[PDB]
Structures are given as structure tokens and as C-alpha cells.
Amino acid sequence: ENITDMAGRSVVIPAKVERILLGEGRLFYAVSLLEGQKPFDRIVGWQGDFRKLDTQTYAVYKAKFPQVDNIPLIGNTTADSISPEKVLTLNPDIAIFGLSGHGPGKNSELVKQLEKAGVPVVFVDFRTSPLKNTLPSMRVLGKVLHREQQANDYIKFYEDNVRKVTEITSKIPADKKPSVFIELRAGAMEECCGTAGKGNMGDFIDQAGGNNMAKNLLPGALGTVNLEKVLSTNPDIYIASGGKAPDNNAPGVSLGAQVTKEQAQSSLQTILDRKGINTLSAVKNGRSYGIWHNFYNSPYNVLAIQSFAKWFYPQQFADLDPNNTMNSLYSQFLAIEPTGTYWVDST
Amino acid sequence: NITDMAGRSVVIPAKVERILLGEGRLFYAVSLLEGQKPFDRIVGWQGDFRKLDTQTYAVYKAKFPQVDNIPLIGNTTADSISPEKVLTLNPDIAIFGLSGHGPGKNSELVKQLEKAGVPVVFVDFRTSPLKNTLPSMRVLGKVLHREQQANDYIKFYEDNVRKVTEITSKIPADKKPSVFIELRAGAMEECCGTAGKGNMGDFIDQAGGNNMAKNLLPGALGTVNLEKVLSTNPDIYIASGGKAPDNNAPGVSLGAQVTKEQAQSSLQTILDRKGINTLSAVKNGRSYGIWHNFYNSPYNVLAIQSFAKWFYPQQFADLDPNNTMNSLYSQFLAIEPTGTYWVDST
Amino acid sequence: NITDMAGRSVVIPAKVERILLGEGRLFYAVSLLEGQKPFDRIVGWQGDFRKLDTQTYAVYKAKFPQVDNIPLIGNTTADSISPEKVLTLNPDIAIFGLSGHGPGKNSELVKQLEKAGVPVVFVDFRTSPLKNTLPSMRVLGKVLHREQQANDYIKFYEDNVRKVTEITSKIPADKKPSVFIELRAGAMEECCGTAGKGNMGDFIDQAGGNNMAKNLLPGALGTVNLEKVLSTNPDIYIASGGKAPDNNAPGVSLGAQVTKEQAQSSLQTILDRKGINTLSAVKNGRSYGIWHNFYNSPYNVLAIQSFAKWFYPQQFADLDPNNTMNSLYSQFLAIEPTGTYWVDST
Amino acid sequence: NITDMAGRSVVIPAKVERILLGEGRLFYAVSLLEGQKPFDRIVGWQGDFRKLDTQTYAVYKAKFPQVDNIPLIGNTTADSISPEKVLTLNPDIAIFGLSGHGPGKNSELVKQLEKAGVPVVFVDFRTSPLKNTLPSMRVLGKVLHREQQANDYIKFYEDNVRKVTEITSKIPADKKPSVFIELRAGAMEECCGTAGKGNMGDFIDQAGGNNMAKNLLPGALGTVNLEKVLSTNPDIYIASGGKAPDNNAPGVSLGAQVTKEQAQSSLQTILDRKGINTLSAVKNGRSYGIWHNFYNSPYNVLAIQSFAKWFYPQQFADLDPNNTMNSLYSQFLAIEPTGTYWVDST
Ligand SMILES: N=C(N)NCCC[C@H](NC(=O)c1cccc(O)c1O)C(=O)N[C@@H](CO)C(=O)O
Ligand SMILES: N=C(N)NCCC[C@H](NC(=O)c1cccc(O)c1O)C(=O)N[C@@H](CO)C(=O)O
Ligand SMILES: N=C(N)NCCC[C@H](NC(=O)c1cccc(O)c1O)C(=O)N[C@@H](CO)C(=O)O
Ligand SMILES: N=C(N)NCCC[C@H](NC(=O)c1cccc(O)c1O)C(=O)N[C@@H](CO)C(=O)O
Ligand SMILES: N=C(N)NCCC[C@H](NC(=O)c1cccc(O)c1O)C(=O)N[C@@H](CO)C(=O)O
Ligand SMILES: N=C(N)NCCC[C@H](NC(=O)c1cccc(O)c1O)C(=O)N[C@@H](CO)C(=O)O
Ligand SMILES: N=C(N)NCCC[C@H](NC(=O)c1cccc(O)c1O)C(=O)N[C@@H](CO)C(=O)O
Ligand SMILES: N=C(N)NCCC[C@H](NC(=O)c1cccc(O)c1O)C(=O)N[C@@H](CO)C(=O)O
Ligand SMILES: [Fe+3]
Ligand SMILES: [Fe+3]
């Protein structure tokens, strides 16, 4: 059969799939929602970003599935480090790639090599245009991986849990919305400050009824705004993203499966104590928050949209709990138990 | 002739120059009428303003040292008022409160004054602020011949309250936060004082909150036990106080001579008390301090706004009670606004 | 005692609480000193701020409705000021401008005030901004007892101007672009109003531009005919305006309530006028709009910067006048920055 | 205490209970202030509302039959008002219009009332709606002690007008459509009544139209000959009327008791008249009907919106003046909106 991927390309659905290639490792998150209690059964190989840039979620899956260590790494954390030779010798029967990210895009040579080898390629997207692409991506993955039921179940769950936010924020007029700046991998980049424009976590700010101060500063989904521009705009709400492991002395916010509330609050505070940042009205007024970075490329991003709405309008979403949503997500779909801290408030 | 807050008819004097204040802090209503000559027409007052509002007192003393020479007709309780000292001041009007630290409608002193031919006016900012605050000012305007100042203050008040009520009057009950207000928190012998259907409860109602003690109490004021608070575990905790900074007694420091630091530090002591410190609202940082004397003052629009910002922070992001306060002072009063009348927990 | 901008010695009042503004838009200098209480000390003002700055007025009214009750001593001309209404406000200081829509150093009203024992201070942001802006603020600081605010603003101003002059002071004349500024472009009976050696001309000088009218005119303001502009055919065209968005009269829309799109649309109308539209600067996109009231405001550092960025685009690509405005507002003012104070042609 | 629309100072009465309406249709401004008790304070009125607004009258009569007992001080002209009947109603305030079917600022009756000690207030929705509508409501608020209702209505009005001006203020003159408005079209002896720089002309201006009579006429109202209209051949034709459905006199049927099909049929008659029917605007279907009494009513924001949607159909496709009217009625009035106040040609 045939379907349209997120690059507009038609893909012939394989009769049976047993050798999935992951162009970006963290595309595993979309796969995990379909594979039930057998998450790694059909993965022939993956980019090393999941294992190296998601060490916490990795370790949790390793403790329950030690065979994860033996899935081949086709590269490190950049598209340019992928050996096309190692890829082809795994004889994949499907390759899942992202329109953007740490893996090959629609115009890469590897995509063309795979087309010459007779291997179907599917483009998904949770990163450039999450709002447009997240649900269509899951529907498509459902069809090509023969997990239509799991996919449709997850779409219903997602739509319902997002509708809990949008029923309220879709009617709020622009002049009542809080200004928001999201600093991606805050503290951890060479040059401050990474953020999202019209795309990526910007889509989440939009949905949650916020006003992204970088929406109109930037052409793309990702970009950079200077510290002074942030200070000058002086937004209502400051959000920092990170995924740093607890026992990592490098700069950044600690969030993820092995992070405690106190490690998340302490490390957010370091981030908020930085020169310039610490004079923001949002920081002084305590409207300062942390969000787990990898939500920037995951269909679990409904958790971030909900955390954002609850920060943007605390009393209108007093009754909404993203922790229940994660637990409903894990119990319904996944094969591990939820642990750690995926979001934090400054004390 | 006018009808006071006790339903009684009062013949308005032709000229008033000797006002008796049954409760000292009724001065607050008078101050909105007297412009730059606040104490010119006060023959005497209950000692509650001087002794239970030491900060606001000291500020007025520095600009008007003659305030120290206004006679104190008693201390802080109705029973300590000498009716003899009262009558020798030959008042031409007496202003009393339906409730509080001064005589009520059925006291002997009220009857003595009626026998002496002295008009008595009952106001209320304390039992039923919502029903009574504006009618009280209207009445004080008429009997003190300051109708203009009164009407000016009513317009100011209604406008600044309507900023809140036009939003919160349409909010359904199930979207409202539960609220407990602990009056003079930390400072009473037995915890915990609060307000029912009345007093600061009216402010919670107006600001679109849900007062957990509304149905626990028959009156405007009363007491709920600590364990009942813990068990109800309300969304939002509010502590009232008016303690002076350099007062080692227990309570929250708020008022004209209090810095935000002192207010924040002393609120924290209050929030660190056994039991209180495990409240969800305290842990989640939805914990606040409000200046106690707003429990009996037509300046109470400042508290209604502070509550609304606490109950729905974003919907009232743009509302600033410091600006309401500054406008109030500049338009009506004879002193400069200083100190901290509200605080948020660190 | 201090020396004002007219060279006159002025005795500093011990306390000031009743400031008279000879020109309403002199408020801008006062606003930098009064913090969160902008209108607290203004007894009255010329009607130019309320009538010729409707946008900035409306923004302050929404936060301080008491601004509507400040008395207007006249309309928009010195000759419409009733000296009687002025004197009954019993000012304790009067602030006047060497030039503009209010009384000057030789007016009768200035003499009346001297007879009444009222100190008069002359400032200037309009005739000789470069010489006078900072000295004016220093002086206002001393006579209004806001030396701290004044010195803070001077440091901010000098630093933000030095960002421009460090570069443009070393540029030789032959590398400078020729510039014509058309004040209230489109909106005068006879084209074309502009500035000579003074007013916005000072800004062109500082920003390293070459004002084509510098030597055509004797004074700070004057008129140059359309044909003279066409013939000089300058490298850069700048139009000033302050027209409200919803005003169908001719002129450029700029100010607190103007969007970038309205500013551009209305600048374009101005650039589409016969004669103007054949200028090389217009055809080549070197066409800009600046908010007119910068012609008399110590916020004029915002214009010196917008000019420097138009005169030398890459040399000041890192300079942002919007950040400077926001630092100005947050540090000194009581309102939030909105609208469009400068625009580039599409 | 307040300045009316004639520039005259009027002393705000302490309590008003006997309002005299110089022009009956000034009721529309009063109705926005009186909530559910519209006629409670009206001692008498000009007969224009009852006789020239039969539809809106009948609707109020069905809910309030006591409206029939309000005294008529005259018919539909200032000259038919008995000053004697007026004075025996012992009004405590009289509201008059700068222009219209009632007395003006120089009438004898105004002087009689001044001799009788009765405050007179001039409002205006007719000569200079743009300048005067909102100031008129502000003033009526103060003198009738309905400041809250007035301020509420001003905010509503400004917001609903801003929906139009946000768009039309940035449209350049050369892109605007030419417009002719024929007042009480078909119903006058001599064609064609219209508005100049004033009256419905102000609405055309605001809605981003170009009134072809703006410079043909000195006043707010006047007459332009059919041939002049034909020759100018404007982009858009608008006819006003308020004729009752069951009235076979010439004119457009619009108002509270008119269906869309009766408004369309009667507009068509108006558009089928010799000369009119050769207009480009008529042939192209840019032909419309507007309810005449908007020519003197603070509900005129409904016509400004209806005009903008006719001037720029797609730019205002999302704007609905019917939703605006309904928000107006529900927020402010005591009756239910019915009928057709505007119509498009089939
Ligand atoms: N290690 C490298 N040299 N490049 C990494 C490639 C992915 C790159 N990532 C980001 O730009 C980024 C920014 C903020 C926060 C993040 O977590 C990021 O991963 C990227 O997105 N590249 C884009 C544009 O080149 C793409 O592939 O389309
Ligand atoms: N494309 C680039 N040159 N820089 C942007 C991203 C590269 C790199 N990203 C990460 O290390 C990373 C970690 C966790 C999750 C992610 O998605 C990541 O991308 C990065 O941020 N590099 C810094 C240097 O430390 C920088 O380039 O400023
Ligand atoms: N020092 C005293 N013994 N009594 C004070 C007199 C008034 C008494 N006050 C309170 O109950 C009270 C409660 C909470 C917070 C406060 O500031 C209070 O003053 C009181 O209210 N009495 C009632 C009952 O008699 C009344 O006056 O009607
Ligand atoms: N009804 C009572 N017996 N006590 C409650 C009120 C009396 C007393 N009040 C104050 O000290 C006070 C201080 C500032 C402002 C006020 O309105 C006040 O009422 C009080 O609280 N007594 C405590 C023991 O100190 C108590 O009786 O529990
Ligand atoms: N409406 C009037 N008749 N006069 C206005 C008085 C101020 C007069 N202004 C200007 O000439 C002017 C020119 C260009 C742009 C502007 O904004 C202007 O205000 C003025 O400056 N007069 C001079 C000399 O008369 C002065 O007083 O110094
Ligand atoms: N000195 C004069 N006689 N005329 C020039 C200025 C007077 C008047 N000014 C303004 O309208 C004005 C508006 C906004 C800001 C200002 O500073 C202003 O001065 C003016 O220019 N009138 C025009 C008539 O359109 C004219 O002089 O031709
Ligand atoms: N019924 C009359 N004979 N006269 C009415 C007096 C008001 C007169 N009105 C109009 O001319 C008019 C024109 C077009 C449409 C209308 O609804 C009108 O009411 C009028 O305005 N007269 C002038 C001069 O006296 C004025 O009132 O200012
Ligand atoms: N000034 C005049 N003489 N005539 C113009 C207005 C007088 C009269 N008005 C009305 O009939 C009328 C009806 C509803 C609402 C209004 O405001 C009105 O004025 C009128 O129009 N007379 C006609 C004769 O048909 C005329 O003078 O042409
Ligand atoms: Fe008390
Ligand atoms: Fe000027």
C-alpha cells in the first residue's frame, strides 16, 4: 500500500517490517508508542543521539532490556558522522528519518543510497512543525509499521489531552496573553541564547496560549536571540530547557528519568543566577520554569504543552496534572515505569 | 435626615466641628473626607488607632504633631471607654461601628449620647463590607458635610473594584480556588482566627475565591481549628497582620513603616509554624500576607485587588494595587504612601 | 541657587509641590524625575501635551485617570494662556521653555510670576538640544529635589549618545551623507518645515549627518521651498510626524498607539507627494520617519540613535534604539513602552 | 462643574429625578444610563421620539405602557414647544442638542430655564458626532449620576470603533471609495439631502470612505442636486430612512419592526428612481440602506461599522454590527433587539 510522509513523498508500505532503521535515535519515542512490551524487537540500528543525548531514558530501558546495548549505532550525534556503509549492511526494510535534527534530511546522499537499494524511507517530524506534523507523523508510522491500532489509540489520547488546553487558550485574545521566552539548552550553549521561533517549542507556547517573544525575531524553527534583546523585551515568563544528567558537572538544567525534584530545582536556580538572566522580571517574580529539552522532538510533547498552559494561566489549569497524563501515557503505551522530573518550578 | 447602617434615622447637624470616633480606626473613613486638614474636627477617639495602628499613627504625627493631643476616650475595648470623659468633650456627632473595638448600637453610651442631644451615626466596614462600605461613606459624607469628597471616593472605589468584579462575577464556582484567611495569624492565643460570611470573607467572595470558612462559621468573625484547615487543605493560604517591624511579639509585619524584606521574613516565620508548613498552598508558594486593618477600612479595595491577583495571577497581571494605593493617597490624603501592605512568599 | 537656560539665577525652593508647566510637553523632562508618581506635583500645564500628544496622554490616563483633572492654563499657543488662571493655582515653581508653544523669557506672565514671588526656570530641548538638554535636566533635578533621578538620567543619556559619537565624531565631512528633515511633513500649509543649526539639526550633526538646511536658515526652525530640496537632492530624506492612527488629516502617524504597518503606510503617503517622490533618497529607499515630539524632549537620544543607524547602517547594526527606549522606560517611567517612534520605508 | 457641548459650564445637580428632553430622540443617550428603569426620571420630552420613531416607541410601550403618559412639550420642531408647559413640569435638568428638532443654545426657552434656576446641558450626536458623541456621554454620566454606565458605554464604543479604525486609518486617500449618502432618500420634496463635514459624514470618514459632499457643503447637513451626484458618479450609494413597514409614503423602511424583505423591497423602490438608477454604484450593486435616526444617536457605532463593511467588504467580513447591537442591548438596555437597521440591495 502507499502513504504520504512528512516530506510530501509517497512511501510504499512494506508487507511486514522487522528491520527498522532510525535516522535519529530519539525517533525511538514515536516507535515506543507502537511496540508495546516489545520496544526494541524490530530495531536493526539507530543514530547514537538516543544513547548519548538521552542517557537517563536509555539507562532505564537497559535495566529492563540489556539487549539495547547491542543495537548498532550508525553514527554519533550528527548526520555527517553516519557511515552509509554500516547502514546498508544492516539490510533495513524501512528507514525512519526526521525533516530536521541530528540525523539525515530529505536531500542527504544516504536517503538516495537507500532508494537505490530498494529500501522505503519515511520522513516524520516532531521538531520543525510539531503542531502540523506530530499527529500525521504517528498516523503514518502506524501504517508503515503495522501498528494502526496503537497509533490511533495514541492520537485519541493526545488530541483529548491537548483539547483540555486548547478549549480554553484558543479563545484568549492576544492582548491578555503572557509574553514568553524559551531558552533551549540554557546555560549549556557556547553563545546565548538558543530558542524557538515559529516552530519547535514555539508551537507549544502558541497552543498553550502564550506569546513567544522570538516568534517574529526568527525565520526558522530554531535560532538565536542575544541576551540583551531578551533583557530589553523583559518577558512575563522565562522557561529554560535542559536534559542534563544529575551527576554531570557541565552547565545546564538537570531534567529526565533519573532526576529528583531537588536536583531539578537546584540546577534551574544556577541557570537563573547567571548574569543578565537574573535581572529578568520573570526571574525576580518567580515566573521561571524548566522543561525537559527532548520534548523538542517527541510525540510525548503533549506533556510540555500542558506544563506550559499551567505556567501561563496557573488558576485556569489548577485542576490539570501533566504527571497523571505521563502516567496514563506510560501505563497505556510503554514498557517502563515513569520516574524522575520532566518539569520544575523555581522555589 | 439620613438612615445609618443600624437602620436608625439621624438628624444631620447644620455644622460639625467636634467629631467623636467610637473606634479610632474609623479615622480611615474620615481621612478620605477631610483632605489636608485630617484632625481638625476630631474632638476625641477610641485608642485603637493610636495603639493598634502605631505605624500609620507615627506617619501622621511627623506631619501633624497635634495628633498626640487628641483625647483617648478608652483603650482597645468598648468596656474601657469612660462615658464621662466622652460627654465632657461636648461632641456634636459620634461615629460608631456596628461591630469592633468600640460601642455598638445597644450600648449604654449610645443611650447617654441620645439623652445629651448628640447625633449618633453607625457605619460598617467590618461585619458586611460588601453591603456597607459604600453606603457608609455616602452617609458620612452627608452628616460631615463632605458629600463631594465622599462621592469622589465612591466613584474611585467602584471603578477600582469593578476592574475585579467584571471578571470574577462571571467565573463559575468549580473554577474558583479554595481560600483560607488566617486573621492576625501567629498572634492569637488559640489558632486560627478567620472570617466567615463577612469581613475579609466578603473580599474573597468579590475576588472570585471560595472561602473555606464561609460555612464553618455563623458570623463574620470566628475560629477554625488548625486540623480543620489541614484537612480541607485549601488552594490558597492568606495571613493577615499589622505588626510593627521592631515588635518581638508573634505575627506578620505589615504597614506604613514595613519594608518588603521585613514583610517577607516575618510572613515566612508565620508559614514555618507546625502544621501550616505542610499545607499544599504553602509548599506550592500560594501563600500571602495582607495588612490586618483592611478588615475595617474603606481602603479595603486594595485587599480585594491583592486577592484577585493572587486568585488569578494572569487574568489580573496588568492590575497594580500599588498604583491604586498611590492614586488613593494623592487624591484624598495628606500623607505620602510608604511601607508594605501586602507580600508574597519567597 | 542655580543658573537656568536663559542665563537667569533661580532660587531653589525648599519644598516643591505645585509645578506649573509653561509647555505641556515639558512633562517629558519631569517624568524622568517623578518615578511612579508622575502627576503628583503638577498644578497645571499648557494644553499642548493633552492636545498635541494625544497618544502618550491616553496611555498615562488609562493608568492615572486623575490626569484629566490637571488644569489647562491654555491651548497650544503662548497667547492663549490666561495669566489669571495661572496665578490662582498658586504655583511654587514654573517651568518654561526658551522656545515653543508656551511663554518665553520676555513674556508678561514671566514678569507677573516674578512679582508674585514664584521662581521661574527656563529649560531647553528645542532650540539648542546639544547645548541645553543635559544642563536642563541637571537644573530640573536641583529645583525639583530629584538630583538622584536627574544624575541617573544624565549618565544613561551620555552613555547612549557616546555609543554614537565615539564613531561619528571622527568621521570627516566629505564622508558624511547629506540629509533633509521635513518636520510635520505633509501637515503644514506651506512645504517644507525643517531645522537649521538647532532642533533636530543638532541630532543630524551628532549622528554624523550633513544637514542641508544648516546654512539655509538663521534659526533652529524655518522653511525651505520644495524646489530647493529637489535641487540639493540630498542623500537621505527624513519626515517627522506624530499623527494619531485614526486621524485622516495629512501627516505621518507615529507614537505610543501606532503600529509599524500604520507608520509605514502613512510614511508612504508622505513620500508619494508630488516633487518629494522624485527625490533620489526617496527612489533609493533612504527615506525615514521620526516621531515629531523628539523635537522637544530629553528622550531625544532615541532619535540621535535612529539617525546614526540610518546614516551609517553597518557601523551601528549592533545598536538598537528600542532597547534604549525600554531601558529608559523601565529605569525611569511609570508606563510600559508601546507603539512606533521610528519607521523605515518599505 | 462640567463643560457641555456648547462650551457652557453646567452645575451638576445633587440629585436628578425630573429630566427634560429638548429632543425626544436624545432618549437614546439616556437609555444607555438608566438600565432597566428607562423612563423613571423623564418629566417630559419633545414629540420627535414618539412621532418620528414610532417603531422603537411601540417596543418600549409594550413593556412600559407608562411611556404614553410622559408629557409631550411639542411636536417635531423647536417652534412648536410651549415654554409654559415646559416650566410647569418643574424640571431639575434639561438636555438639549446643539442642533435638531429641539431648541438650540440661543433659544428663548434656554434663557427662560436659566432664569428659573434649571441647569441646561447641551449634547451633540448630530452636528459633530466624531468630536462630540463620547464627550456627550461622559457629560451625561456626570450630570445624571450614572458615571459607571457612561464609562462602560464609552469603553464599548471605543473598542467597537477601534475594530474599524485599526484597518481604515492606514488606508491612503487614493484607495478610498467615493460615497454619497442621501438622507431620508425619496421622502423629501427636493432631492437630495445629505451630510457634509459632519453628521453621517463623520461616519463615512471614520469607515475610510470619501464623502463626495464633504467640500460641496458648509454645514453638517445640506442639499446637493441630483445632477451633481450623477456627474460625480460615486463608487458607493447609501440611502437613509426610518419608515414604518405599514406606511406607503415614499422612503426606506428600516427600524425595530422591519423585516429584511421589507427593507430590501423598499430600498429597491428608492434605487429605481429616475437618475438614481443610472448611478454606477446602483448598477454595480454597491447600494445600501441605513436607519436614519443614527444621524443623532450614540448607537451610531453601528452605522460606522455597517459603512466600513460596505466600503471594504472582505477586510470586514469577520465584523458583524448585529452582534455589536446585541452586545449593546444586552449590556445596557431594557428591551430586546428586533427588526432591520441596515440592508443591502438584492
Ligand atoms: N553537533 C552539530 N554540529 N550539529 C547538530 C545538528 C542538529 C542541529 N541542532 C540545533 O541546531 C539545536 C539548536 C538548539 C537546541 C538543540 O537541541 C539543537 O539540537 C539542527 O537543528 N540543524 C538543523 C539546521 O541545521 C537541521 O538539520 O535542519
Ligand atoms: N548546530 C550547532 N553547531 N550547534 C547547535 C547544537 C549542537 C549541540 N547540541 C547538543 O549537544 C545537544 C545535547 C542534548 C540534546 C540535543 O538535541 C543537543 O543538540 C550544542 O548545543 N553545542 C553547543 C556547544 O556546546 C553550541 O553549538 O553552542
Ligand atoms: N481585646 C478584646 N478582648 N476584644 C476586642 C474587641 C472586638 C472583638 N474582636 C474580635 O473578635 C477580632 C477577631 C479577629 C480579628 C480582630 O482584629 C478582632 O478584633 C469582636 O469582634 N467582638 C464582637 C463580638 O462582641 C463584636 O464587637 O460584635
Ligand atoms: N475577642 C477576643 N477576646 N480576642 C480577639 C481580639 C482581641 C485582641 N486583638 C488585638 O490584639 C488586635 C491587634 C491589632 C488589630 C486588631 O483588630 C486587633 O484586634 C486579640 O487578638 N487577643 C488575642 C490574644 O492576644 C486573643 O484574644 O486571641
Ligand atoms: N499655532 C501657532 N500659531 N504657533 C505655534 C507656536 C510655536 C511655534 N512653532 C513653530 O514655528 C514650529 C515649526 C515647525 C514645527 C513645529 O512643531 C513648530 O511648533 C514656534 O516655534 N515659534 C517660535 C517663534 O515664533 C518661538 O516661540 O521660539
Ligand atoms: N509657527 C506657526 N505659525 N506655524 C507652525 C506651527 C504651528 C502648528 N503646529 C501644529 O499643529 C503641531 C502639531 C503637532 C506638534 C507640534 O509641535 C505642532 O506645532 C502648525 O504647524 N499649523 C499648520 C497648519 O496645518 C501651519 O502652520 O501651516
Ligand atoms: N420639521 C421641520 N420643519 N424642521 C425640523 C428642524 C430641524 C432641521 N432638520 C433638517 O434639516 C434635517 C435634514 C435632513 C434630515 C433630517 O432628519 C433632518 O432633521 C435642522 O436641522 N435645521 C437647522 C437650522 O435651523 C438646525 O437645526 O441646525
Ligand atoms: N428643514 C426642513 N424644512 N426640512 C427637512 C426636515 C423636516 C422634515 N423632517 C421629517 O419628516 C423627519 C422624519 C423622520 C426623522 C427626521 O429627522 C425628520 O426630519 C422633512 O423632511 N420635510 C420634507 C418634506 O417631505 C422636506 O423638507 O423636504
Ligand atoms: Fe480587631
Ligand atoms: Fe510644534
Tab-separated table of N, CA and C in Angstrom, chain A residues 176-178 236-237 287 311-316 318-319 347, chain B residues 174-177 235-236 286 310-315 317 346:
chain	number	residue	atom	x	y	z
A	176	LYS	N	-4.270	39.594	26.179
A	176	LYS	CA	-4.356	39.036	27.522
A	176	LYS	C	-3.313	37.930	27.715
A	177	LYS	N	-2.538	37.624	26.656
A	177	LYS	CA	-1.572	36.530	26.702
A	177	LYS	C	-0.271	36.997	27.346
A	178	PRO	N	0.427	36.149	28.130
A	178	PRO	CA	1.744	36.489	28.640
A	178	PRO	C	2.840	36.354	27.595
A	236	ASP	N	7.154	38.149	30.332
A	236	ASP	CA	6.395	37.846	31.533
A	236	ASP	C	6.930	36.566	32.172
A	237	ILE	N	7.277	35.583	31.320
A	237	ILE	CA	7.583	34.218	31.717
A	237	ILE	C	8.879	33.759	31.062
A	287	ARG	N	8.248	33.690	38.007
A	287	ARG	CA	7.644	33.033	36.851
A	287	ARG	C	8.739	32.449	35.951
A	311	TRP	N	1.719	26.940	33.432
A	311	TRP	CA	2.580	28.083	33.825
A	311	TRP	C	1.991	29.409	33.308
A	312	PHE	N	1.322	29.397	32.153
A	312	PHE	CA	0.801	30.611	31.552
A	312	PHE	C	-0.471	31.071	32.255
A	313	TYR	N	-1.295	30.144	32.755
A	313	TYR	CA	-2.528	30.540	33.435
A	313	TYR	C	-2.797	29.668	34.665
A	314	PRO	N	-1.999	29.802	35.756
A	314	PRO	CA	-1.988	28.821	36.830
A	314	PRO	C	-3.360	28.420	37.355
A	315	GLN	N	-4.263	29.370	37.528
A	315	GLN	CA	-5.560	29.012	38.150
A	315	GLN	C	-6.523	28.397	37.115
A	316	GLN	N	-6.462	28.842	35.867
A	316	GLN	CA	-7.360	28.243	34.885
A	316	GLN	C	-7.019	26.767	34.634
A	318	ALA	N	-5.485	24.873	37.232
A	318	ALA	CA	-5.176	24.351	38.558
A	318	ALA	C	-5.425	22.844	38.606
A	319	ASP	N	-6.528	22.420	37.955
A	319	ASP	CA	-7.042	21.066	38.025
A	319	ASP	C	-6.312	20.133	37.055
A	347	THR	N	11.693	27.869	43.276
A	347	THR	CA	11.042	27.735	44.579
A	347	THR	C	10.276	29.013	44.907
B	174	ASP	N	-16.813	26.102	40.245
B	174	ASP	CA	-15.930	24.957	40.097
B	174	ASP	C	-14.571	25.372	39.527
B	175	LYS	N	-14.437	26.623	39.081
B	175	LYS	CA	-13.158	27.124	38.592
B	175	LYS	C	-12.475	27.991	39.658
B	176	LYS	N	-13.147	28.206	40.799
B	176	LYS	CA	-12.638	29.097	41.833
B	176	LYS	C	-11.656	28.367	42.738
B	177	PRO	N	-10.577	29.026	43.217
B	177	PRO	CA	-9.692	28.408	44.200
B	177	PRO	C	-10.274	28.448	45.611
B	235	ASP	N	-6.484	25.705	48.381
B	235	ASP	CA	-5.607	26.037	47.272
B	235	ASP	C	-4.648	27.151	47.683
B	236	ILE	N	-5.174	28.139	48.442
B	236	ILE	CA	-4.504	29.407	48.715
B	236	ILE	C	-4.590	29.727	50.206
B	286	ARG	N	1.569	29.375	47.045
B	286	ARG	CA	0.368	30.198	47.023
B	286	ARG	C	0.041	30.659	48.452
B	310	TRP	N	-3.861	37.296	43.400
B	310	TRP	CA	-3.426	36.003	43.969
B	310	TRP	C	-4.341	34.871	43.472
B	311	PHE	N	-5.643	35.137	43.310
B	311	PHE	CA	-6.564	34.084	42.914
B	311	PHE	C	-6.442	33.773	41.425
B	312	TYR	N	-6.133	34.768	40.589
B	312	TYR	CA	-5.992	34.510	39.155
B	312	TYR	C	-4.828	35.306	38.557
B	313	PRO	N	-3.560	34.956	38.862
B	313	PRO	CA	-2.423	35.834	38.579
B	313	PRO	C	-2.388	36.415	37.167
B	314	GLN	N	-2.696	35.615	36.154
B	314	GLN	CA	-2.568	36.136	34.775
B	314	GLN	C	-3.769	37.021	34.437
B	315	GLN	N	-4.961	36.625	34.851
B	315	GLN	CA	-6.105	37.431	34.464
B	315	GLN	C	-6.015	38.852	35.032
B	317	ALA	N	-2.812	40.272	35.666
B	317	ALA	CA	-1.392	40.595	35.520
B	317	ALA	C	-1.186	42.103	35.468
B	346	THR	N	8.547	34.118	49.391
B	346	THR	CA	9.725	33.822	48.593
B	346	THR	C	9.715	32.335	48.270
